[PDB]
């Protein structure tokens, strides 16, 4: 079949080494390794077949090599095909499918990446203009579907377990604390919070390593809020321990936290697990030998299994996660590092015969990571929210007004006070808790 001349329609120039490379050692479709932006637009709207995975990967990751205004111009230019019997086939096997693919790209763009249009009103204007000029019959159903989407964007099965209570009674907000709430319910309510925080993070906050740059507060607000929650719970656990100066009471505190970890494990809240593991690895807590001495061996083993998830670059964490099925809450840190090193450890552009080609497979690699993040965001936990426990943890503020350094220095100095360095003898401290320290355990009530 015959096409127009690349002097009137730029997407007709033929493939070459200066145009498109394919991956050599890997659903019937070739995997594009690199190509000019023209060639990338061409295969994004290919006439021979549709390529849903290329369209998904592309729209998730294009902003590093092409601006949104430029992409819209390019797909409009791909749409407006000039002509060269022969025509009748051309219309049916080139213009028709190529134009349907353009409309498919617009549909997916408006549907899954509408933030491009929220952050540039003129981009949404050009899109509506373009869609308005589309006048065909094979088009009509696509033109109306895109317009419905645009208009919209401009605006359990079984029952969950009974909520568990320990010393604090429902509604007695003022008595909520680490030892008075039920350990099972602490873990559950923290899992609900952390699950929602995990589910709110969008790929727009991750592609381009944008959470590490000076506008991170603007571009990754949900990711940062999630991390700051995790950090807060770690620091809260450390503070509960070292501010409990009586040894027997501190053993009760450390022991209860380990029971919270066990339930975290039961629920596949790996963010929860790591909150606890990080707290036990911290300088103020790790050195408290007299406290771990009294921890019963069964809880030691629970904490040991949890900590070992993090050893050898998370080897066991990664296996354990691959083997569970939703709902879970993954630890996000690994994803951040892998996305960052992928973007920083691979060239933005490959050179072939002096010609510059966008390195797309590096973008594929990053979309694979954001894809794995989304697959764990689908399924929610079958657990009931407790409005008040939830607010208790939403408002935890262990640091108060102190700065990081001042506060972690204070935690460490508390550690040294309650168990001084080995020469000095171990002092005694008066109890601070009026209620009984015995734990209800982690098996539910019925």
């Amino acid at each position: 079949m015959r096409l127009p001349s690349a002097d009137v329609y730029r997407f007709a120039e033929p493939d070459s080494e200066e145009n498109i490379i394919f991956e050599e050692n890997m659903a019937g479709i070739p995997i594009i390794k690199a190509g000019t932006v023209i060639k990338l637009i061409e295969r994004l709207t290919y006439h021979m077949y549709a390529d849903p995975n290329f369209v998904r990967t592309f729209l998730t990751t294009y902003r590093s090599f092409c601006k949104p205004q430029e992409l819209l111009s390019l797909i409009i230019e791909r749409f407006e095909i000039p002509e060269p019997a022969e025509l009748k086939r051309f219309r049916k096997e080139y213009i028709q499918p190529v134009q349907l693919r353009v409309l498919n790209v617009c549909r997916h763009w408006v549907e899954h990446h509408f933030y491009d249009f929220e952050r540039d009103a003129y981009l949404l204007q050009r899109m509506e203009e373009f869609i308005g000029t589309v006048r065909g019959k094979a088009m009509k159903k696509w033109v109306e579907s895109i317009t419905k989407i645009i208009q919209r964007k401009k605006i359990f099965q079984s029952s969950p377990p009974t909520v568990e209570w320990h010393i604090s009674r429902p509604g007695h907000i003022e008595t909520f604390d680490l030892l008075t709430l039920h350990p099972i319910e602490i873990a559950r309510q923290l899992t609900l919070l952390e699950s929602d925080l995990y589910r709110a993070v969008q790929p727009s906050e991750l592609v381009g390593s944008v959470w590490t740059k000076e506008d991170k507060e603007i571009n990754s607000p949900n990711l940062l809020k999630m991390i700051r929650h995790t950090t807060n719970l770690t620091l809260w656990f450390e503070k509960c321990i070292v501010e409990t100066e009586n040894l027997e009471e501190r053993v009760a505190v450390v022991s209860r936290i380990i029971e919270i970890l066990q339930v975290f494990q039961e629920l596949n809240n790996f963010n929860g697990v790591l909150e606890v593991v990080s707290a036990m690895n911290s300088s103020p807590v790790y050195r408290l030998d007299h406290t771990f001495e009294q921890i019963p061996s069964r809880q030691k083993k629970i904490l040991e299994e949890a900590h070992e998830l993090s050893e050898d670059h998370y080897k066991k964490y990664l296996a354990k996660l691959r083997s569970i099925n939703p709902p879970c809450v993954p630890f996000f840190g690994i994803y951040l590092t892998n996305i960052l090193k992928t973007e920083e450890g691979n060239p933005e552009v490959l050179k072939r015969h002096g010609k510059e080609l966008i390195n797309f497979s590096k973008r594929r690699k990053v979309a694979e990571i954001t894809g794995e993040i989304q697959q764990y965001q689908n399924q929610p936990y079958c657990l009931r929210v407790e409005s008040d426990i939830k607010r208790f943890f939403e408002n935890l503020n262990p640091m108060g007004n102190s700065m990081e350094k001042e506060f972690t220095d204070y935690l460490f100095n508390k550690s040294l006070e309650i168990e001084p360095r080995n020469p000095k003898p171990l002092p005694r401290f008066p109890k601070k808790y009026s209620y009984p320290l015995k734990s209800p355990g982690v098996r539910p009530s019925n």
Partner: peptide, 9 residues
């Protein structure tokens, strides 16, 4: 030795 939550040999 080997972390405070480990079985001490």
């Amino acid at each position: 030795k080997f972390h405070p939550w480990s079985v001490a040999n």
